[PDB]
Amino acid sequence: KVKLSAKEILEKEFKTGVRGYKQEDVDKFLDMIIKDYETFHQEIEELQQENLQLKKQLE
């Protein structure tokens, strides 16, 4: 299924090295990805709940 979560991306620590990516660039970009994971999960939960309610109304 899904490999990561918003929490795992928040708490991920990368090791450092010479000529590594600037931390500010990477962390601001991953913060947008974190908001997306939250958006994705909320939409899925909304749809799974609608799916369940539609099913119940059919039977």
Binding site: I9, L10, Q23, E24, D27, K28, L30, D31, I34
Partner: peptide
């Protein structure tokens, strides 16, 4: 911390 960037700044 609620964001990576806020943790990075504080550190």
């Amino acid at each position: 911390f609620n964001s990576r960037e806020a943790r990075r700044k504080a550190n």
